[PDB]
Amino acid sequence: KSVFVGELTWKEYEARVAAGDCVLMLPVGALEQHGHHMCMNVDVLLPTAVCKRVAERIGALVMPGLQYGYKSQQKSGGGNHFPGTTSLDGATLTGTVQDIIRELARHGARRLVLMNGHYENSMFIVEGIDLALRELRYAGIQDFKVVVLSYWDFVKDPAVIQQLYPEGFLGFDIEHGGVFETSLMLALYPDLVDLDRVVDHPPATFPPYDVFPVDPARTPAPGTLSSAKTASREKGELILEVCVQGIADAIREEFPP
Amino acid sequence: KSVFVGELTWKEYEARVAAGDCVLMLPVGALEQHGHHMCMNVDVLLPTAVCKRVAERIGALVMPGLQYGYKSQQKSGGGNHFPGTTSLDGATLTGTVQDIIRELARHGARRLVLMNGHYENSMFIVEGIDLALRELRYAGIQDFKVVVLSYWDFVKDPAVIQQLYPEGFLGFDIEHGGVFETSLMLALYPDLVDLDRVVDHPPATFPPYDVFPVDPARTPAPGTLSSAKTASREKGELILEVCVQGIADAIREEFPP
Amino acid sequence: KSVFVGELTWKEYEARVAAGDCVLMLPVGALEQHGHHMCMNVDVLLPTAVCKRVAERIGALVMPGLQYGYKSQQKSGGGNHFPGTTSLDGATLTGTVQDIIRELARHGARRLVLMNGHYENSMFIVEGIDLALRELRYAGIQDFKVVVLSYWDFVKDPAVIQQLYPEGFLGFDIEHGGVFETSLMLALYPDLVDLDRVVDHPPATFPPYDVFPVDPARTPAPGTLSSAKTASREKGELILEVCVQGIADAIREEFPP
Amino acid sequence: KSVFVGELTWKEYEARVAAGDCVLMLPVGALEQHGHHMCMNVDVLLPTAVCKRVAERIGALVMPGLQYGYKSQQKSGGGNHFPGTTSLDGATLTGTVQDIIRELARHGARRLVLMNGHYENSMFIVEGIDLALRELRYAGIQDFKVVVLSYWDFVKDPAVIQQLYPEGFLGFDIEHGGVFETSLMLALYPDLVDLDRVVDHPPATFPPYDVFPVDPARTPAPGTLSSAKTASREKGELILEVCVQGIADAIREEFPP
Amino acid sequence: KSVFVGELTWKEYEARVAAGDCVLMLPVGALEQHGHHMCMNVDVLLPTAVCKRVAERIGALVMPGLQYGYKSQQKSGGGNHFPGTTSLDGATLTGTVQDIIRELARHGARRLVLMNGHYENSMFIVEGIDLALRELRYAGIQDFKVVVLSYWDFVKDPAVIQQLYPEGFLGFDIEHGGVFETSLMLALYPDLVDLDRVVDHPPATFPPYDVFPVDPARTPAPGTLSSAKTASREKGELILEVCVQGIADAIREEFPP
Amino acid sequence: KSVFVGELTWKEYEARVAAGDCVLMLPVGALEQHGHHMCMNVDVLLPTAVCKRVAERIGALVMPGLQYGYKSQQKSGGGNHFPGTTSLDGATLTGTVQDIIRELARHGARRLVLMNGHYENSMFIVEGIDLALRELRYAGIQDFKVVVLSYWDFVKDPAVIQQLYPEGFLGFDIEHGGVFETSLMLALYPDLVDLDRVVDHPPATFPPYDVFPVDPARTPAPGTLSSAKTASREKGELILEVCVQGIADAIREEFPP
Ligand SMILES: C[As](C)(=O)[O-]
Ligand SMILES: C[As](C)(=O)[O-]
Ligand SMILES: C[As](C)(=O)[O-]
Ligand SMILES: C[As](C)(=O)[O-]
Ligand SMILES: C[As](C)(=O)[O-]
Ligand SMILES: C[As](C)(=O)[O-]
Ligand SMILES: [Mn+2]
Ligand SMILES: [Mn+2]
Ligand SMILES: [Mn+2]
Ligand SMILES: [Mn+2]
Ligand SMILES: [Mn+2]
Ligand SMILES: [Mn+2]
Ligand SMILES: [Zn+2]
Ligand SMILES: [Zn+2]
Ligand SMILES: [Zn+2]
Ligand SMILES: [Zn+2]
Ligand SMILES: [Zn+2]
Ligand SMILES: [Zn+2]
């Protein structure tokens, strides 16, 4: 009926897990400012959309996504001084991932794909996985396998990059509310993007270090780390296809039928 | 426009908070089995739906809802031994609520309505609020106000109850996947309900005590605590309006514009 | 000798546990204001007294009671803003329950009755039990059984309620320092109750929601949620025999020799 | 007319704290094996008894005692491998002390005397105090003062030691269930002591290091670290009076009127 | 005398802090496998050596370094399945950083440079800083400034990269026990590096995702992610001067006299 | 050729552990003021020096030492109000010890000697050990043995004490920056001691209780608890050999081949 676990009855879910090779996917996002031109739930919407499409291709199921993520960092997300951005402490995010894995194992599930959509989440997701696997080991369970990834890492083909950045690629480091996400949003949730509001400032540049308390003067006023002026639905559809295809293939490789 | 914070840009959010009487609403649900006839994200869908309607009428905003809640208890949700049900440890839920309040305070927001949709969440939501307010006090903030409630508590009117349970009301204690929720779902998400699957068993009853480890034999096989056979969109619509109107008035009273 | 573990030598205790079917009882109370007419250790004294009597009747033992419980809530205990009331954070209470169960398992005990006397403790006791049972499982122990209850839940019989509330029962929700506890104290510790100090105010009434920071104005001045003016030692003796008999029978059922 | 906070109404407590010079005392014990001749709640009973007598002489109030303490260590309490002994994890004890100090400060109290009765508790009580004071500081409170002491430390005077130990004193290192404690119990709770069970074994001695997992063979079979055969009521009455007087003086010195 | 705080008397340290503009530097490393050719304390030795030289150049002091860091990750450090590697859980590392910052603030210090030498530590160092700064804020301190950096990030000049990697720079992703660290060790601790033990395997290549439990088969047998065959003392001297010069300038900029 | 794990390659370490009888030693110190005449890293340097010499004699290996320890206490370290002293919270130190033991067990190691050099660390090291052993049990490991000791406890022989304190030994209670440690430092790191700066003040003494917030006036201005004027290299060389020999024998006794 649906690839979303939340829309299934427990009997339907139980039956899918009973199959023996059931793959579950968990989107991990954040509520974070994304400039003057885009909504703040982008980091949840994108990995969730990708999960949905991948799940439909490989016959997987998608768990409710984590709506709040780790604190936004200046050099990757603009900084946690912006209003709207609502961040969790590291222990909180870590504990959430850990609890979910513990429960999935209780269900009998043994295959999980954690799809991150918020850069800063990475290491806390990692600690959550480790702490959960540690407990499972104490419970005599060592066959639970986890694949963790950030969907954008699948866009590495030079050909695609050239098509996405005709004037050259500066790296994902400045991709917060920039061309990459804005394009994907234009292809998935266009009504949540107001391109005319984009502030066309030069790419953010930082020295090889970080400063705390976060200094607002060091992040472009709009919150974006690069201009999304050249973003488009076409680019978004290209990104989506590349991500969906590459991830579906990776999951097939790691969790063969 | 949208009443969902996640769909706003940080500038739009900032402007609403800048108004001075901005009311924020946070749905807190769970992924929990709800019988053979209904999906598992009910505890998220319902309080979120009520929040949306209330927010539209009073000019409030709704934060992304918490998808996972505390462990299901036998006497209220059937028990955490059911597959599908994916629960958090108490410290995790408490920490999530606490972090969000801390961040909302940072934004300059001072009015929050926590709408619970999962009975078992209550005390951990309470602790999250207390710990957060304790920190705000240390930070020199004492004007942050929180109103917490479970939407179903607003169905008090005997006339309404009579209209909802023409055969006599047995209490909310057995209302897990029963008439109350099923009726709401029939009016909001009919495609996520199939009354034909309803197992018409007698209302669950228990002795005045609890037993751990949870014993599956003490919970009706389907997971429901009462039959939803008499559920109807009509009953659902009545319930919805009653809750929306009552909650809207409660908020107008506690957070006068 | 005694039914109190603290009054036994480790040799005696060891011998009792060696019986193989030894039942242990742990009272969990609190230090909380109980109006102008009763002392603040009521939530410890009452469950302890019930445990003592039940333990004597069925041959069980009683562990030292927890003297401090979770934060008093307005709608059930008046609120944590009252002086005298000395509350623990949830993690502290949960951890205390968890540590004790771990230790009892180490002793070889496998049967525990947790008798709550402070309404607000419930869910934290529940979490303590779950976390402890989780650990025991990792330790290879799955035969530890726990029965958790609040002594007042055993007073259900309409004929009993009738005698206790001839003018009509309004529910346990207003029973903080009211007729129920005051009657029990009059029968158990008359010297710690001064009925002449009772403030006969109308029953506390609240809207279908909760407000934080707790608003002192919403709780009856004396701290009571209802008047104990009609309390009596005779009503207390009835309540005691009903609770002792009901609980004793419950334990015989769950923990047969 | 009680010195115990638990036996006072919140109004009586409030009035005493309103004096502005109220001294509060918190007994901290443990449930620990104490040989074949004595009960296990000794570490709670003694400091409580001393607190009662001191409070009566200086006009102080006594808080409910902590019934469970830190894990028993071989060289001082016999070891945590003994049945009956029910110990808390360090974080639990620390958190308990921290929570109480926070609440007492909320009451407006500013003078606390923690009376330890279980040697192993010391450092966790210290951490609890430090964490609480750090927190009070954030709340703008720096006038909260705490005095921590173990009643036995007030038995210094060689003259007194002479009477207690004629054949020479050997330090409190082996004073667990020995002459010192048994004598106090014979004077306070003789019904909880049976010298006819005292195993007259040689004083326990250990190498200059500790071993974990704890080795049972390194602790005298009885659980005691020294024989209490020569214990007596007379000796107890001596110790008691010396401790009560000495401690009362110290409190008058630290919390001068 | 020495730039190491540990080798100063508390009087000397106090005098330096009393200067009002004293900069403290804290090396954060790890105990981790570094192939067959280098010792396991490299992540401590390197940042410490850089701090030493930077401190001497701009007159700062160096705090004792953190010897244990976060769990080694496959794609960055080879994996935590290797023997020798001794890692801390995230909460432990975060808490250590938090504690030290709190203490330095107590000293009156307000300038800190956290120099990371183990890639995986980064986000836990960040959380330590945030939690510590949050507390300081509660204490009324908002003038404590922190500069966090990984020393290798200062080697970015194209001309410098060309010299170090004439064949072509493949990126820092594969720099664990490779050319970069080995060259530095050759120049700083030649006796702890045996280049003749280097296993000249192809650069480690990984798909755009991570797998847990870590699969030993996915990491080159030696533990290195790239061959240090072309490492040299001369390349090390170049890296050292670039790092020391770049970092010293950064500190002069962020912490002017 | 090195006894330090940090200076070994993972292969060398692996080989030593593969033997099956490898003994590991973990120095646990602190950064703490030690008067006007000595450096602050003393508590790390001494236990480490002893570990090195013991390891060389019995064939053990020395892990990187813990540089930061628990808060300094007035009666033993002068107090945590002194500048320079940088202390961890109890949970942090406990967690660090716990994580290391967990990792060593993962390596296959099963014999650990924890050598404390900072008195105040004791109980938190104990808790870390207990929590780790508890975890190991859940993992099916019960053959991990730990020996905890403070190197100064092996210096008790009257013949030795006589030479060290020919004028009378007052106990280790006042041994903070006194003759004992200063003598060891004069023998191991004379450059880190300026005996001319010693403040020949009378031995510190305190009432039989503690006060918090710590009162500065109760600690000798210098920070020392006893004058080290009597210190000498010869005395240190005596202590060193005594400890090294005693500890080596103790280890041979507990971890026999
Ligand atoms: C830099 As991002 C995709 O977490 O906004
Ligand atoms: C008892 As319910 C509304 O949380 O499923
Ligand atoms: C509501 As009550 C029995 O915990 O005071
Ligand atoms: C050594 As004791 C007084 O804590 O039993
Ligand atoms: C990748 As590294 C410098 O932490 O070994
Ligand atoms: C009393 As000490 C050796 O920890 O300074
Ligand atoms: Mn993001
Ligand atoms: Mn529910
Ligand atoms: Mn109560
Ligand atoms: Mn004891
Ligand atoms: Mn590393
Ligand atoms: Mn020390
Ligand atoms: Zn984003
Ligand atoms: Zn529901
Ligand atoms: Zn009560
Ligand atoms: Zn004792
Ligand atoms: Zn490295
Ligand atoms: Zn020292």
Side-chain angles (χ1 to χ4, degrees), chain C residues 177-230:
Chain C
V179 173
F180 199 97
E181 296 185 296
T182 306
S183 292
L184 275 173
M185 284 295 288
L186 283 173
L188 300 169
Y189 299 97
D191 295 295
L192 302 179
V193 191
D194 301 317
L195 209 60
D196 46 315
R197 299 182 196 281
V198 169
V199 179
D200 185 42
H201 62 73
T205 66
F206 305 93
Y209 58 81
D210 214 6
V211 176
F212 298 95
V214 59
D215 179 3
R218 310 190 191 213
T219 295
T224 45
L225 294 188
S226 66
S227 172
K229 182 180 179 58
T230 60

Side-chain angles (χ1 to χ4, degrees), chain A residues 154-230:
Chain A
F154 281 77
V155 177
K156 60 177 299 301
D157 182 53
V160 179
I161 298 298
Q162 185 176 301
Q163 293 177 288
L164 294 181
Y165 302 79
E167 295 182 294
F169 188 50
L170 296 64
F172 288 125
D173 40 74
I174 55 171
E175 286 299 330
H176 173 62
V179 171
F180 196 97
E181 298 185 294
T182 306
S183 290
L184 264 182
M185 283 294 286
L186 284 173
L188 296 169
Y189 299 99
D191 301 317
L192 296 180
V193 182
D194 314 305
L195 217 55
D196 64 295
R197 302 190 188 178
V198 169
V199 177
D200 191 47
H201 61 70
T205 66
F206 304 91
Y209 60 85
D210 213 356
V211 172
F212 295 95
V214 58
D215 181 1
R218 311 193 187 207
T219 297
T224 47
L225 291 189
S226 63
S227 174
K229 173 173 277 289
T230 63

Side-chain angles (χ1 to χ4, degrees), chain D residues 7-198:
Chain D
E7 309 191 316
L8 307 180
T9 70
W10 72 272
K11 296 301 298 180
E12 304 179 324
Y13 176 76
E14 190 185 36
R16 289 293 288 275
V17 176
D21 62 353
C22 184
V23 172
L24 294 174
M25 304 181 89
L26 178 61
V28 186
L31 183 61
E32 191 186 26
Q33 66 73 29
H34 275 75
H36 303 180
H37 72 291
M38 203 147 60
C39 62
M40 299 184 276
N41 68 21
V42 171
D43 291 342
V44 171
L45 295 186
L46 300 191
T48 298
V50 174
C51 282
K52 186 182 184 302
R53 296 168 173 64
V54 172
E56 298 179 312
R57 301 188 181 184
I58 65 182
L61 293 173
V62 187
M63 294 287 287
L66 296 187
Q67 312 289 299
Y68 303 82
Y70 186 64
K71 298 151 187 171
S72 178
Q73 296 312 303
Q74 184 163 61
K75 295 187 180 182
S76 54
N80 215 69
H81 53 108
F82 279 99
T85 295
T86 310
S87 311
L88 304 180
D89 270 6
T92 308
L93 179 51
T94 291
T96 298
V97 169
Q98 174 185 6
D99 288 350
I100 295 168
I101 291 171
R102 177 190 303 117
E103 288 282 271
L104 290 178
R106 175 176 64 69
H107 299 169
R110 293 289 189 278
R111 304 176 175 185
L112 176 65
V113 177
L114 265 112
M115 188 171 291
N116 185 42
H118 178 57
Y119 187 67
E120 292 89 330
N121 292 331
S122 292
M123 296 310 294
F124 302 95
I125 292 175
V126 164
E127 177 71 334
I129 290 170
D130 188 69
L131 296 179
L133 297 182
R134 171 192 293 168
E135 190 168 357
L136 298 186
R137 185 149 58 265
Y138 299 154
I141 299 173
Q142 312 213 195
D143 61 331
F144 196 106
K145 178 177 177 177
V146 183
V147 174
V148 179
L149 60 81
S150 292
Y151 73 82
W152 58 77
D153 291 315
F154 285 68
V155 179
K156 312 165 67 65
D157 181 56
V160 182
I161 301 299
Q162 171 58 62
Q163 289 176 290
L164 297 177
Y165 304 77
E167 284 64 61
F169 184 51
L170 301 180
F172 297 122
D173 297 296
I174 44 67
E175 280 302 328
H176 172 62
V179 174
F180 193 103
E181 274 183 332
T182 302
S183 293
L184 282 170
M185 285 297 284
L186 286 174
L188 299 168
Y189 300 100
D191 288 45
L192 295 177
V193 183
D194 190 320
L195 283 60
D196 298 303
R197 300 175 185 296
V198 174

